[PDB]
Amino acid sequence: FDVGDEYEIIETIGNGAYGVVSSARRRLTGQQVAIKKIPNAFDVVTNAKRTLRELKILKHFKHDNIIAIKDILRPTVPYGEFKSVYVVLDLMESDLHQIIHSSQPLTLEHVRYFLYQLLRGLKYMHSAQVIHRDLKPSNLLVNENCELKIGDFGMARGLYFMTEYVATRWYRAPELMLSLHEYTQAIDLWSVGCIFGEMLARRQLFPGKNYVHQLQLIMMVLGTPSPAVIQAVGAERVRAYIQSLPPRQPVPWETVYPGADRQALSLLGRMLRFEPSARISAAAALRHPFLAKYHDPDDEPDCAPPFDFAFDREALTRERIKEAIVAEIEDFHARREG
Numbered sequence: 645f646d647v648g649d650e651y652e653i654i655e656t657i658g659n660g661a662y663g664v665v666s667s668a669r670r671r672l673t674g675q676q677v678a679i680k681k682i683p684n685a686f687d688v689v690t691n692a693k694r695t696l697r698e699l700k701i702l703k704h705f706k707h708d709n710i711i712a713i714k715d716i717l718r719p720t721v722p723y724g725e726f727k728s729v730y731v732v733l734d735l736m737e738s739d740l741h742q743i744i745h746s747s748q749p750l751t752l753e754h755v756r757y758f759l760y761q762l763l764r765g766l767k768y769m770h771s772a773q774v775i776h777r778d779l780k781p782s783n784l785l786v787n788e789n790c791e792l793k794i795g796d797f798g799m800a801r802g803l804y805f806m807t808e809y810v811a812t813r814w815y816r817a818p819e820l821m822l823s824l825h826e827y828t829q830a831i832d833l834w835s836v837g838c839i840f841g842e843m844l845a846r847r848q849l850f851p852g853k854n855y856v857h858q859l860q861l862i863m864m865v866l867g868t869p870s871p872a873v874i875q876a877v878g879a880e881r882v883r884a885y886i887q888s889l890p891p892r893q894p895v896p897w898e899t900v901y902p903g904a905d906r907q908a909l910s911l912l913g914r915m916l917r918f919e920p921s922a923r924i925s926a927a928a929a930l931r932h933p934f935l936a937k938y939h940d941p942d943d944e945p946d947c948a949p950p951f952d953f954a955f956d957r958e959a960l961t962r963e964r965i966k967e968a969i970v971a972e973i974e975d976f977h978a979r980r981e982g
């Protein structure tokens with residue numbers, strides 16, 4: 645690490661393919677933060693593009709249920725030697741994966757409040773025309789006061805070919821799996837369904853071992869998909885596999901989750917569907933009786949203007965992307981002078 649005399653590192657808390665997250669605190673004030681070192685940020689084209697996407701998306705959003713950038717450290721060395729980017733972020737106590745899968749409490753009210761906040765965050769996000777495409781419990785961060793923030797926007801796109809490799813298997817929407825040529829904000833609401841069902845039972849809803857077994861377990865609850873959907877499948881082998889299986893009626897959610905709440909299973913049923921148009925939106929989900937306790941439309945804003953993904957469609961070299969990223973770091977600091 646290399647954060648200067650402004651911050652103070654404590655302990656490493658997270659690590660992925662393109663990020664080393666660590667807790668810290670600012671010395672002038674004392675408040676706790678998360679610093680995320682992106683090492684060798686400009687060495688690979690895909691990694692540089694993800695980095696510039698996250699910076700622009702997180703700079704666009706200002707919402708209590710979306711991770712915010714608190715600061716981006718400027719280059720300490722001259723430009724040519726600037727290899728590692730440091731991003732200062734909201735520090736959060738844990739994530740929902742850890743919360744669900746532990747000896748911690750998770751009563752119905754926990755699920756209701758967590759779900760409300762996720763959906764509150766998605767309403768704002770979706771109004772900006774941004775699909776997250778990778779919502780899972782481990783990307784839903786939770787703080788000491790039970791506030792839930794959505795994080796990791798590197799997979800996020802707006803409104804390609806190999807769609808079945810978008811996201812993680814267990815939370816991947818059918819339309820991506822089967823390539824149904826209708827990819828919208830609806831993708832996220834499938835994932836929210838899986839998250840919701842996971843909180844109710846404290847185990848994964850559709851834990852598939854492989855591509856085919858993922859389709860099995862989904863069809864064991866939802867039943868066999870309709871002929872309209874079946875014909876919409878692009879690959880010959882998948883369509884052939886579904887048609888070989890016998891017809892199956894949908895199992896009621898009241899039987900899938902026996903002891904669970906009646907109003908919860910109602911809203912779950914509106915999320916977990918084969919047809920993406922058949923799924924309830926985030927905005928309509930907030931209007932459901934299950935979330936009546938927390939719902940207030942004056943406290944649930946949209947995002948305006950929407951997010952432009954045109955920058956990501958450009959064919960830029962590693963250096964041009966480094967220039968683009970450095971421009972954002974400059975723009976961030978220039979925006980905080982008024």
Ligand SMILES: CCOc1cc(N2CCC(O)CC2)ccc1Nc1ncc2c(n1)N(C)c1ccccc1C(=O)N2C
Binds near residue numbers: 667678680733734782
């Ligand atoms: C005070 C330490 O709190 C934590 C403990 C654990 N652990 C202890 C280790 C156990 O094995 C597992 C749970 C995990 C996370 C946090 N907090 C935290 N806050 C903020 C972020 C973050 N994590 N990372 C890693 C993210 C993860 C997913 C998506 C986004 C982020 C992100 O961008 N930020 C800034």
